[PDB]
Amino acid sequence: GKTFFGQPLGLSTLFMTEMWERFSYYGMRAILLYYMWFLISTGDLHITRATAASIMAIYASMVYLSGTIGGFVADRIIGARPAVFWGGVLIMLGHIVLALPFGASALFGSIILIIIGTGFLKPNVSTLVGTLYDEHDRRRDAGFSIFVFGINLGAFIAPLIVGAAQEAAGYHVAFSLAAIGMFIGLLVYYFGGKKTLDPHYLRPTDPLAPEEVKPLLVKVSLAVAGFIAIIVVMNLVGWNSLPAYINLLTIVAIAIPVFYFAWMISTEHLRVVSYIPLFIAAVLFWAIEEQGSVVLATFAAERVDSSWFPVSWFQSLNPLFIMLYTPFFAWLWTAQPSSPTKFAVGLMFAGLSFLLMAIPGALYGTSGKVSPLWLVGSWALVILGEMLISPVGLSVTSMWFLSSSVGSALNAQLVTLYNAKSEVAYFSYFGLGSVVLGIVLVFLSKRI
Ligand SMILES: CCCCCCC/C=C\CCCCCC(=O)OC[C@@H](O)CO
Ligand SMILES: CCCCCCC/C=C\CCCCCC(=O)OC[C@@H](O)CO
Ligand SMILES: CCCCCCC/C=C\CCCCCC(=O)OC[C@@H](O)CO
Ligand SMILES: CCCCCCC/C=C\CCCCCC(=O)OC[C@@H](O)CO
Ligand SMILES: CCCCCCC/C=C\CCCCCC(=O)OC[C@@H](O)CO
Ligand SMILES: CCCCCCC/C=C\CCCCCC(=O)OC[C@@H](O)CO
Ligand SMILES: CCCCCCC/C=C\CCCCCC(=O)OC[C@@H](O)CO
Ligand SMILES: CCCCCCC/C=C\CCCCCC(=O)OC[C@@H](O)CO
Ligand SMILES: CCCCCCC/C=C\CCCCCC(=O)OC[C@@H](O)CO
Q: Which atom of ligand 1 is nearest to the CA of 77?
A: 12
Nearest residue (by CA) to ligand 7, atom 11, is 372
Q: How far apart are CA 6 and CA 8, in angstroms?
A: 7
- Minimal CA–CA distance to 84: which of 34, 153, 160, 21? 21
- 346 close to 287: Cβ distance less than 8 angstroms: no
Is residue 91 within 8 Å of 83, Cβ to Cβ? no
Pairwise CA distance, residues 346 & 293, whole Å: 19
User: CB–CB of 162/30 below 8 Å?
Assistant: yes
DSSP string, 74-97: HHHTS-HHHHHHHHHHHHHHHHHH
Instruction: Decide if 179 contacts 92 (C-beta within 8 A).
Output: yes
Closest Cα to atom 5, ligand 5: which residue?
359
122 marked as part of a ligand binding site? yes
The pocket around ligand 4, CB under 6 angstroms, is made up of 352, 355-356, 358-359, 362, 424, 428
Of 38, 55, 63, 113, the one to substitute when testing ligand 2's pocket (max ligand atoms within 8 A of C-beta) is 55
Q: Which ligand is closest in space to the CA of residue 377?
A: 6
Alpha-carbon distance 50 to 70, whole Å? 31
334 Cα–ligand 4 center, Å: 36
Q: Take atom 10 of ligand 1 and give the residue whose Cα is closest.
A: 69
User: What is the spatial distance between Cα 4 and Cα 11, in angstroms, rounded to a whole number?
Assistant: 7
CA of 427 from ligand 4 middle (Å) equals: 9
Q: Is 432 in the pocket of ligand 5 (CB under 6 A)?
A: no
Distance CA 410, CA 287 (A): 7
What Cα–Cα distance (Å) separates residue 12 from each residue in 6, 136, 152, 312, 432?
A: 11, 21, 15, 29, 43
CA 207 to chain centre: 29
Q: Assess contact for 249 and 58: CB atoms under 8 A.
A: yes
Write the residue with the smallest CA distance to atom 12 of ligand 6: 371
Residues contacting residue 322 through CB under 8 Å, at least 6 positions apart: 152, 383, 386, 387
Q: Is 22 annotated as a binding residue?
A: yes
Q: Give the count of beta carbons closer than 10 Å to the beta carbon of residue 241.
A: 13
CA of 366 to the centre of ligand 5 (A): 14
Ligand 6 center to residue 305 CA distance, Å?
A: 11
The residue contributing the CA closest to ligand 4 atom 14 is: 362
Task: Name the strand (E) or helix (H) holding 219.
Answer: helix 213-237
- Could you tell me which residues come within 8 angstroms of residue 363 by beta carbon, excluding any fewer than 6 positions away? none
How far apart are alpha carbons 74 and 361 in whole angstroms? Answer: 49
Question: Quick check: CB of 33 below 6 Å from ligand 6?
Answer: no
Q: Are 122 and 70 in contact (CB under 8 A)?
A: yes
Contacts of 247 (CB under 8 A, 6+ apart): 412, 413
On the CB side of 373, CA atoms within 13 Å amount to 1
With a 6 A CB cut-off, is 445 part of the ligand 9 pocket?
Answer: yes
Q: Which atom of ligand 5 is nearest to the CA of 359?
A: 10
What are phi and psi for residue 268, nearest 5 degrees?
55, 50
Q: How far apart are CA 243 and CA 363, in angstroms?
A: 34
Nearest ligand 1 atom to the CA of 62 is: 1
Distance 389 CA to ligand 9 centre (A): 20
Residue 4 three-state SS? strand
Spatial CB neighbours of 210, under 8 Å, sequence gap ≥ 6: none
Q: What are phi and psi for residue 341, nearest 5 degrees?
A: -65, -25
The number of residues in the chain equals 448
The whole-angstrom separation of Cα 102 and Cα 298 is: 24
By CB neighbour count within 10 A (0-12 exposed, 13-18 middle, 19+ buried), where does 237 fall?
exposed
Read off the amino acid at residue 133: Y
Contacting residues for 32 by C-beta, under 8 A, at least 6 apart: 56, 59
Tell how far the Cα of 341 is from the centroid of ligand 9, in angstroms: 12
Q: Where does residue 269 fall: left (phi above 0), alpha (psi -120 to 50 degrees), or beta otherwise?
A: alpha
Ligand 5 centre to CA of 352 (Å) is 15
Taking alpha carbons only, the member of 439, 229, 416, 226 closest to residue 341 is: 439
304 phi and psi angles, rounded to 5 deg: -110, 135
Distance separating alpha carbons of residues 128 and 195, to the nearest angstrom: 14
User: Atom 11, ligand 3: which residue's CA is nearest?
Assistant: 213
Would you list the DSSP string of 336-401? ---HHHHHHHHHHHHHHHHHHHHHHHHHH-SSS-B-THHHHHHHHHHHHHHHHHHHHHHHH--TTH
Q: After which residues is the chain broken (C to N over 2.5 A)?
A: 266, 335, 397
For ligand 2, which residues put their CB under 6 angstroms from it?
A: 55, 58-59, 62, 104, 107-108, 111-112, 115, 227, 242, 249, 252
Alpha helix (H) residue ranges in 291-338: 295-303, 317-334
Annotated binding-site residue? 26: yes
Judge whether 110 and 94 are in contact, CB under 8 Å. Answer: yes
Q: Which domains does the chain have, with CATH numbers?
A: 1-448 (1.20.1250.20)
Pair 424, 366: CB distance under 8 Å: yes
Resolution in A: 2.7
Residue of 190, 254, 296, 261 whose CA lies nearest to 406: 254
Task: Compute, in angstroms, the gap from residue 60 CA to the centroid of ligand 1.
Answer: 17
Half-sphere exposure of 358 (CA within 13 A, CB side): 15
Ligand 6 centre to CA of 379 (Å) is 14
317 lines ligand 7 (CB under 6 A): yes
- Please give the Cα distance from 418 to 49 (Å, whole number): 10
DSSP 198: -
DSSP helix/strand/coil, 101 = coil
Ligand 3 site residues (CB inside 6 A) read 77, 207-208, 210, 213, 216-217, 220
Nearest to 415 by CA among 58, 35, 4: 58
The torsion of the CA quartet 43, 44, 49, 53, rounded to 10 degrees, works out to -170
- Residue type at position 81: R
